[PDB]
Structure 1
């Protein structure tokens, strides 16, 4: 009858108990120091469910766990209305260049300068690098691009050679705002200021930093008219073509559980969201399920809704094939010595 949520960390736990109070014991709590550990608890059946990102889903899918509800995020386009009925699409990981540099295509990237949001980031790293392994067949992506700015790698690396830090020699290649070329924005600036030949960002990154949308000096005089997406065809389409010229769709996070206790979770959550969701009965009142004393506890903070999925998809399908191609190959290069 009860659903046991698994909290990764002492603060998720703190929230999970409030949830349990308000829910009048309909949702109780397990907890673990790691996510992989919470996954396990779901397998062992010591905990029922928890929300996971593209990558953890895979992990858990492979261990035979199942997506249940996606986590839809507030957006520019999303109707925002009756979102519970289906998932929204989620970021389009795109490769971006300037129109100038004609030679550049998804095929001719070897030994170019690269700009990454940060290491281990989905659109900035996992997706693009994952699909380059698919090309090269090899795992030596550390040495694919001549030099790069990938915040979070070793400052000594060539993967950090392009990163600028605070421009006073400090905080080179760190995954913070302190690193000049960090983030979607920073990777895009990395491109704009001709430090790098390709930037791996998302659709909007381009738009929201062109044609007046950004007041930053490097951004003032930037026209979408001057940048191209790279498609997997090796075709260079305009910036407006993200929809059919992306690398992959960043997966929406997803609530996950065993099939044997899948539809129960589903049924129990939709109610808890009605009580505690963005505009549920008791949200401004007793407990908001998508607000966090810290940030992103149990659920990302900017969660519109948990969404009924489209039938009964396997993780392979829920994640999209492009993404798995990637995470797979980075999971093969990962765990290389067996």
Structure 2
């Protein structure tokens, strides 16, 4: 038997008002239960939630950002969806309206009366001010943005703005006595609709509202045309025309709750039913997405198909997305820094081992490449999708993912084939390493059929290196998903600490990071992949050819395999035979795409560029290489970049993840995820949609 009530908080009184009905009505059907908590406004409302008293409630982009933060830390459980022409979406165009004829356009905005939905809201501020910013006569954050804005225009009415110190900004407002400039319904002109009025009534000459404002208000095609629409091309365009005309695009409004014990579960069901039982067009009793004539969008935006549950993992930053995220910091960050933050790179590291390395690179490159590391690799990706990163090397195994999260491949990795070896590589098309299986000269009582439940050595879960290919085969070999029981004891980082799969790991010296997919744990990756059956803890190992050769026979000083033999271990061919490590090529599971760098679509080129320089500085023939740092060098461990890799090269007419990895590798890995499902991916799936 579930829980109590969802104390949804409120801005205006009218807000508390219309809410109540909701409350009432609800009971009539007997589903969930709420309780409209009376309070100041959204902003304040936020705090209320972060101080038990409240929880559920919708917030505009701009807010959300502010929402999930230092002391509040609140995450959007669900975003509301809107149709309105086109198809159901969960994002919207940020635009600028005005009255027909006027004369100015985007840039000429200076010296006029504006209109803003509310101070802060992405819609009527963040983007607006942001896009205009360039020409403004302001520097960095210390000196309030308000001021800047304030005396850029002639005047205006920015609800939440401060009239105290600031004049104009709260001038054009229509608020009655002291009800003027209220960050809630009270002061009229607050909201998308209201703000529209601001211009309609002549006070303001330009309004910055939603891609579907007017429409809502002005039905009769007639009047409607009386106003035009501003497009960043420094010209005007028809109202309905916001596809190529619009300042920006932002994520839809979404209800936010607490990070932990914020009653997530509850909330969902609450809206869930309510948005079906009394959502849009349903019973007459109450109208969910429909506020009174008075003020519009109350509780939730006015007219919006319904809402959709945001995936557990999606966090503030994440949801808003980089695009937004980044042009929503300049307003709190100086002008100088911006530039810096732009041109320059931030590599994402995995495991402190790497972290340390990463660090080095900074000072050497003179900070040009700054750093930021995460725990799991997946964790690193996020950050890039969040923008806190910039880009990082990557296994193809996950490259799939990254791609699916939008980012794409930049340059790739070029090993070293002993032929006409030297510098060519830079453009020399990368072949790709090969998937093979290694056992011992001893235990020859094993074939690719005999395997069953031996001692599986995996570099890590869901990776080109090992896991992926074989596992694929295991599903093409057998139609069963359970790879857990399939093999008795093993070590495949990224899996359950108490699973047959992860099992056999060994953490650190002081037995720390155990099963942890990263440097620390000594059983993750290539190097560690051998240390499995090498010291005899593991059995058949899953690595590429070279692996063996980069340790056995004096190719690694570390205790364990400082003298093992190459001829010792064997490959476990497909038909069922065997081969030596020396003789690879024929006895090869398959060809594996090379690892590579990846970034945010837009942040490509530059990145690449920068990288080349650095690659020109301390790489294979890199002049300053051993004199300071050898980019690719990672004390026989393969940190950030591999170790064999001699250079970074482009992609022969293939920049999609479908193209780089090829339709074969690709379609397959999907099939492998049909069982084991990823959250990050899952996220992206909703996010990218």
* Alpha-carbon shift at residue 140 of structure 1 (Å): 0.2
Say if 2:490 and 2:502, in contact at 8 Å, map to a contact too. yes
* Alpha-carbon shift at residue 61 of structure 1 (Å): 0.9
Change (3 A) 1:70 1:3: farther
Matches of 1:312 and 1:325, distance apart in 2: 16
SS of aligned partner of 2:363: helix
Change (3 A) 1:113 1:74: same
Match of 2:227 in 1: none
Match of 1:35 in 2: 380
SS of aligned partner of 2:584: helix
Alignment of 1:8 with 2:351, yes or no, is no
Tell me the alpha carbon deviations over residues 57-93 of structure 1, each in whole angstroms, 9 at most, x when there is no partner.
1111112322121123457779243221225444322
SS of aligned partner of 1:127: helix
List aligned pairs for 1:15-94, cutoff 5 A. Answer: 15=360, 17-18=362-363, 21=366, 27=368, 29=370, 31=372, 33=374, 34-41=379-386, 48-73=390-415, 79-94=421-436
Say if 2:347 and 2:390, in contact at 8 Å, map to a contact too. no
SS of aligned partner of 1:184: helix
Say if 1:185 and 1:209, in contact at 8 Å, map to a contact too. no
Match of 2:530 in 1: 184
Change (3 A) 1:134 1:272: same
Matches of 1:273 and 1:221, distance apart in 2: 33
Matches of 2:406 and 2:560, distance apart in 1: 50
Change (3 A) 1:3 1:138: farther
Match of 1:229 in 2: 572
Say if 2:530 and 2:547, in contact at 8 Å, map to a contact too. yes
Matches of 1:13 and 1:117, distance apart in 2: 26
Matches of 1:244 and 1:138, distance apart in 2: 28
Match of 1:148 in 2: 489
Q: How many residues align?
A: 313
Match of 1:254 in 2: 596
Match of 1:270 in 2: 612
Match of 1:113 in 2: 454
Change (3 A) 1:140 1:307: same
Matches of 1:284 and 1:226, distance apart in 2: 33
Say if 1:116 and 1:149, in contact at 8 Å, map to a contact too. yes
Matches of 2:373 and 2:505, distance apart in 1: 38
Match of 2:467 in 1: 125
Q: Which has the larger radius of gyration?
A: 2
Say if 1:207 and 1:213, in contact at 8 Å, map to a contact too. yes
Change (3 A) 1:156 1:82: same
Matches of 1:277 and 1:113, distance apart in 2: 41
SS of aligned partner of 1:333: coil
Highest RCO, 1 vs 2 (Cα 8 Å, sep ≥ 6) = 1
Matches of 1:14 and 1:223, distance apart in 2: 35
Matches of 2:403 and 2:480, distance apart in 1: 25
Change (3 A) 1:272 1:150: closer
Say if 1:7 and 1:298, in contact at 8 Å, map to a contact too. no
Matches of 2:370 and 2:549, distance apart in 1: 42
Matches of 2:644 and 2:564, distance apart in 1: 31
Tell me the alpha carbon deviations over residues 105-141 of structure 1, each in whole angstroms, 9 at most, x when there is no partner.
4xx3573524314443654433322331343333201
How large is the RMSD of aligned CA atoms in angstroms? Answer: 5.0
Say if 2:409 and 2:596, in contact at 8 Å, map to a contact too. yes
Matches of 2:642 and 2:391, distance apart in 1: 16
